[model samples]
Structures are given as C-alpha cells and as structure tokens.
Target: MVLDGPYQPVAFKPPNDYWILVNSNSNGVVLEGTNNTDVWVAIISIEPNVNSESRQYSLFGVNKQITVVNTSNKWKFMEMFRNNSNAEFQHKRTLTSSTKLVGILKHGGRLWTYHGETPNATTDYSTTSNLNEISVTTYAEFYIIPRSQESKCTEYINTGL
Candidate 1:
C-alpha cells in the first residue's frame, strides 16, 4: 500500500527541503539526498499485467528483487535487465503481501525500476546520464524517506516533509 496517502511527489534540486533518499550503491541503488534505510522501495502492481506486461511491478528493495525492465549498458541502473541475469532476483522481502507491493514516484516513471541490492550483483558501474535507452538516472528521479532512517544516521523523526 506504499503508505497509501496519495503519495507520489519526488523532486529534488538544492536541498529543496529534504527527505527522499534511498542510497546504497555499487550501482544497484541510489535515489539521492540524505540516505536512510532499514530499506523501503516498493512499487507494486500486477493485477492484469505480467506477460501481457502492463508495468508488471513487484519491485521491493535493499533486500533485493528486481526482476525485469528493458535494458541497455549499465545493468543495475539499479538492476533492470530482462535479457539475462536469468531475470535478476535475489531475495529478502516484507513490505506486506496480498497485492500490496505499494507504489509512488511518477507512477512508474514512464516504466518502472527498483533494483535493490547485491547477490553478487554487478553491471560494471558508471551510469546516470539519463542514457534514455532505458534512461533511469538523473537521480532515477524519485522521492520518499525515513524507512527507519538509520544507517547510523540516527532515528530520523524529521516531521518536515
């Protein structure tokens, strides 16, 4: 349910009043600003679309699970490779089940992407050019914060979003 509340507003540029960070990257995670994280990146939807492919999303985060999405050079634009990696999938999830993968952020940012973390993950680094072949890094364009806000970042209680 992605915390439901009509959530979907992730725009950043110059501290624009903080909150929106999902950082962790060898190249498979990053959404910029002051990172947090016990992990929270779910964009769920799979009612009438999984082979018919209507934005078939089940994307959880940090605790990996990024199955598919069109591809280009930088594989983990946070991992969205559909050609190989046998459809990349490493597990660890609990964002609540029963059609509740949750969502927000440009509704699917013109095609979804949420490639959490390593399971020996590697796409050989260096992306974020909005490469547009499957363009996803310009901050992968996103929003949301404080999943626990504790990467030793301290228990965030910044009620100022």
Candidate 2:
C-alpha cells in the first residue's frame, strides 16, 4: 500500500534576526542572516511522525531526537520521498554561520542543498542563480536575539527540542 500527503505544512513566526525558510515536501529548513551581524535562528526539529516520510526515516514512531551542531560542524537529514518510497532518498542540510545555504527542489531531484560564501563557488548542487526553476516552498522573515545574555526578546521554555 502507498500513502499520500494530505500533509499540512508546519506554521511558524520568524524571529527578528534570521530569515527562515522551510519546505514541507522536502523536509528541509534554512536559516540565514538578514544583516552581516552574528546571529542564531531559534528553530525546532519537532517530534517524529510529523511528516509522511517519518516512519521510513526514523527507526521507530515514538521518541524525541535532536542532533545539534555548531557553526563549524556539518550534517544532513536524509529524506525518503513519498512518491518513490523508502528506496529513494534525498539528502538535505541546514546552513552554517559563514556558509549561505541554497536548497534545491526540482521535479526529479525533489530536495537537496549546497552552501557557500559566494555564488561562484562551483557548478555543483550548492549555489544557483535561478529561482524560476525552483520554487521556495515556505518563506518567512525573523531575527535571532541572545537568550542568556539578557537580550531584548521574549523567551519560551519547553522540554522537547
């Protein structure tokens, strides 16, 4: 049997410091700086079984898992497509501090990403100038403020990540 996405996209309000983007179809999230100043986007990965592909990507349906890495570290979220089943998957990643990430969503590719300081890094999966070929699934504007430094912002504490 096959499942379909009657899937509703995750709704969120962006903070003041970072430009936030999320693709429900791709299971991809991107946080970028609006200004040249240093910042961090307050984002959450959420509980599993949230998406249609959750069962295949995760080992079990119940559990809370969050893998956090610094600006220097690198990682990827491998996602299996609903149309292609568990056999086919696309590797998606978030951006680092200095690296600007570009997420690509296409007919055949579905979802993938690249990162760089400039657009001319290489003709690989990382940078692109064409927005017409790819559509931005979900886009929002927000900023990041220091939570412990007693920065000017509202703070909400929770048990889950």
Candidate 3:
C-alpha cells in the first residue's frame, strides 16, 4: 500500500551516476507494526502549481509525466528532455499516514507502469519505423522495494542508467 507521508529523504549515492541502489528507505521503517516481508510502495507529493494539485510516479526510466497540453512552456512535451515532476510512493502501511495505494508492474522488458499506460525506458523512443509526436497521454513510472520487503522478488536489475 502507498502512504501519503513524505519518505524522509534517502541517502544512497548513485553508483557512478550509472545506477542507483535503494534498498532501505531512510527513516527506515518508521512504524512498529511494519513487517519487512511485503513489497511496499510510497506515494509522496509534487510541486505546488497554480492548478496542479496531484502527485506523480517517477522513475527517470519513463522520463515522462502527465500534464496539460498547452502552448505554455511547462505544459508542452519535449523529447529527449523532460524535467521530472513527482510526489510520492510508499513502503509501509503504518509507516506513513493514510495514502492511496497504487500497483507497479514491470511491463514488456523495461517498461514500468501503474497499469494505465506503458512507458519508455530511455529518454527517446523508437523513431526508426514510426516517428513519435510530442503529443502524449499515457505515462510510465517505476518504484524500488526494500531488500527486507522481498518475498519472491529478489532478483534485481542493474539498469546502469
């Protein structure tokens, strides 16, 4: 289940900016009733915009997010470049305040999603056969789970991204 509370910032340095290893969440298991046997997801918060009042799922894998399609510099989408905007994902139930829970799935090889849409793992998508327009509606985002929270999902993938 996803929590609404902010995950006390994690302090894992990037492995040479190629890959990231995030196993234990900082402010580790901020709950007593917490069990280290379940895959947890946390949902945090996003920047406060005038009309933007929702959170997003970010993995830098999808490198994409959802926003209004307008001519404004912020709303228009850009390929090979997109400033990430995200809020929260969760780890424990009692770890944070009550927040809605969303499921994460590893789609196709590296695509990650919450079930609405499939996302690209790279900043750019396949442009050989078909050209991609800047217009987009669906998005993809992935999350990491703690080493202590693995049941059967012990295999880890090093994206070196």
Per-residue lDDT of 1-161 in model 2, one digit per residue for the tens?
11122223333332322212232223234322111111111222223234233322232121324443233332222321222212222233333212222222222222223333222222123222332233222323222223232111111110100
The TM-scores, one per candidate, come to 0.20, 0.25, 0.18
Q: Report the number of backbone clashes for model 2.
A: 10
Clash pairs (backbone) in predicted model 2: 15-142, 15-143, 16-142, 16-143, 17-142, 17-143, 17-144, 18-142, 18-143, 114-126
TM-score of 1: 0.20
Candidates in order have lDDT scores of: 0.26, 0.25, 0.22
lDDT of 3 by residue, 5-62 (tens): 2334332221111211122222111111101122122222221122542223343333
Q: Which TM-score value belongs to model 2? A: 0.25
Model 2 spans with C-alpha error above 4 angstroms: 1-28, 31-66, 71-83, 87-95, 99-112, 116-123, 126-136, 141-161
Clashes of 3: 10
Candidate 1 structure quality by residue, lDDT tens digits, 102-136: 11122211222222222221112222222223312
> For residue 48, what is the lDDT in candidate 3?
17
Off by over 4 Å in 3: 1-99, 115-161
Better of 1 and 2 by TM-score: 2
- Candidate 3: residue pairs that collide: 41-90, 42-89, 42-90, 43-88, 43-89, 43-90, 44-87, 44-88, 44-89, 45-87
Q: How many clashes in each candidate?
A: 1, 10, 10
Model 3 is weakest, by summed lDDT over 10 consecutive residues, at: 27-36
Clashing pairs in 1: 76-79
